[PDB]
Design a protein around this nucleic acid. Structure first.
Lengths: 162, 230, 118
RNA sequence: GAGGUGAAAUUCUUGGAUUUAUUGAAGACUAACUACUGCGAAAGCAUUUGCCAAGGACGUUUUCAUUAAUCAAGAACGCCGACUAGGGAUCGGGUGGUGUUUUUUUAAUGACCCACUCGGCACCUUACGAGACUGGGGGGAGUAUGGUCGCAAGGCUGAAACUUAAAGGAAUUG
């Protein structure tokens, strides 16, 4: 509701398609108008745009998924590795978020991706090899490492980026 | 070693189309390939076991059945048409993942019921505990005896809705979601219960064929066709 | 007017599968995976490989006579990652870009429902 | 071609692997719902239905009448205390109120809101008190060492009793 006035002109004047918000099933439907909308993949790009926004990234990051179409959005769970009973799960999300977000923002600003993380399922959007870099740093940290060591490894991956 | 040389396998393929039973709206659902009708595996018995998974929105024209895919089993071939019968029903996974929220309970039940035909069906049910309007506590849990009583009346009234239906009558009963309204009306004496659904219907055994019953589900038909002109 | 197949895109890590079958799923039309288009043995999951595989999928589907596909996009599922790889969205985009109409995108990865871990 | 990896590889594969569809069998497991919630003496316990006994809290103008509390031995299973008040939320029971969901001459039976009250798992505070599978050297961070115990250098190898071959090393603008 609060970001709808910034979502749809990137779906009507920037892109070429039309929107409706069902309050029936509380969803967003996207039609492509037949007689003047170009760009035969624009329906798929705008659908994945609002998919990123409803999945949890901010709307400027989802616009970054709309423009520059080679940014995909990987997802995985905490529960796949080390099986994480709930106290250790709290350790896991607190360890990935750091203090005042600084570790997550470090993984953001270094490997050029942007992540968001729900209570047991995290999402990384960006370009695919940087997604793999961020995913391996995250899974090392969720297996449980000193954040100084993951800062050092992040300095090396930033040196790959430079 | 040496593998194989290709010979194009779409020259021996035959196109049939799938006519759905008349317990639905618009009944041409699509087409299907099969190998060409040769001796030693004719095509009309290379078919007859295939189930297709269609969307109830595509079968009913609306979009409030955008979930709830169904299965249609091919039974009788006549004249490049595959006449189907109902074979099951299933939600998409995103629907019940979109329904499950924490701070409530899901009461789910299932019963194995034999209809007025000799089809036996395992038919499921899900229901989620609502909170009333003016409720200020954030929980709205059921006290698990309310769960046992709700699950009891769910089992009783939906095994009353089966046995009192055939397959065609049950299918026409669960298209407009009205067994859910029966569960809601019968259960609001115990707990509020938002969005009760049936969610899944499985065939277990099927009686016999009865071509007459299938053709009465669809419509008639018999052919005297062309004659060779020599 | 459309003839509908189904897409059956299985996009794990390490590989992607673009495998159009008919409306039942019994008869296949051009299974081509990601690792058979270009193989460095590690670019099998890449969006370029998924775009190549979906592009010659759509070539053979236009050859046979299928105009549209219902998309069933799954991941490896099971007791594992449960979410598609980098090739799923690329294969879907290349299938739409290469002439085929898309309908009914749905996520049919096998959620394991009480699995066999420990 | 499929796994798989940071890349690879062992492995499977034209006697058709992987993918897809239908079906069967097996052994586990009980996803999301799932909580600073519940139950259990603890370890622990999550699908449905039934049976078997059990247990707790509450309600009680029921009954017995001191039958009680703590633990060495033995048996079964495997910032503190003797301390004041509170506050919000939640679980189980009870009482009262009087609105909405419920509903009716088939049985009884809900859900929510509010106040009170008993008992729990926690949390946030307050006020006031002497609260007197066994074996052990002696602080932290360093610094020096004409003592004792060790380990360690040389120097082209071959090659020493032999100024000794081949080959190698090193440095090398013959």
């Amino acid at each position: 509701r609060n970001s709808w006035t910034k979502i749809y002109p990137p779906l009507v004047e920037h892109l070429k398609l039309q929107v409706r918000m069902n309050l029936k099933t509380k969803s967003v439907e996207l039609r492509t108008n037949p007689k003047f909308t170009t760009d035969p993949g624009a329906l798929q790009k705008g659908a994945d745009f609002i998919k990123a926004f409803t999945l949890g990234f901010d709307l400027d990051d989802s616009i970054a998924l709309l423009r520059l179409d080679d940014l995909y959005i990987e997802t995985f769970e905490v529960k796949d590795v080390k099986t994480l009973t709930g106290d250790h799960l709290s350790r896991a999300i607190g360890r990935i978020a750091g203090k005042d977000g600084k570790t997550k923002f470090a993984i953001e600003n270094a490997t050029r991706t942007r992540i968001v993380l729900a209570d047991s399922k995290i999402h990384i959007l960006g370009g695919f090899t940087h997604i793999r870099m961020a995913r391996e740093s995250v899974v090392s940290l969720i297996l449980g490492s000193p954040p100084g060591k993951v800062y050092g490894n992040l300095r090396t991956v930033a040196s790959r980026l430079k | 070693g040496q593998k194989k040389r290709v010979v194009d396998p779409f020259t021996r393929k035959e196109w049939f189309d799938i006519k759905a039973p008349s317990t639905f709206e618009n009944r041409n659902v699509g087409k299907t390939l099969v190998n060409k009708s040769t001796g030693l595996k004719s095509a009309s018995d290379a078919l007859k076991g295939r189930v297709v998974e269609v969307c109830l929105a595509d079968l009913q024209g609306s979009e409030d059945h955008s979930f709830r895919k169904i299965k249609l089993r091919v039974d009788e071939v006549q004249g490049k048409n595959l006449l189907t019968n109902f074979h099951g029903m299933d939600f998409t996974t995103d629907k019940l993942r979109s329904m499950v929220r924490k701070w409530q309970t899901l009461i789910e039940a299932n019963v194995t019921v034999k209809t007025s035909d000799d089809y036996v069906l395992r038919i499921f049910a899900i229901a989620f505990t609502r909170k009333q309007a003016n409720q200020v506590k954030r929980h709205s849990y059921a006290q698990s005896s309310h769960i046992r009583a709700i699950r009891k009346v769910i089992s009783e009234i939906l095994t009353k809705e089966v046995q009192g239906s055939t397959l065609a009558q049950l299918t026409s009963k669960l298209i407009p979601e009205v067994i859910n309204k029966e569960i809601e009306n019968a259960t609001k004496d115990i707990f509020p219960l938002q969005n009760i659904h049936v969610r899944k219907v499985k065939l277990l055994k099927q009686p016999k064929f009865d071509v007459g019953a299938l053709m009465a589900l669809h419509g008639e038909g018999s052919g005297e066709e062309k004659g060779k002109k020599v | 007017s459309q003839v509908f197949g189904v897409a059956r895109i299985y996009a794990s890590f390490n590989d992607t599968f673009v495998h159009v079958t008919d409306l039942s799923g019994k008869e296949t039309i051009a299974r081509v995976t990601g690792g058979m288009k270009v193989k460095a043995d590690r670019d099998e999951s890449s969006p370029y490989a998924a775009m190549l595989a979906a592009q010659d999928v759509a070539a053979k589907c236009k050859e046979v006579g299928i105009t549209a596909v219902h998309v069933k996009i799954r991941a490896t599922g099971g007791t594992r990652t449960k979410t598609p790889g980098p090739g799923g969205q690329a294969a879907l985009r290349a299938l739409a870009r290469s002439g085929l109409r898309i309908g009914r995108i749905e996520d049919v990865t096998p959620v394991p429902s009480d699995s066999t871990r420990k």
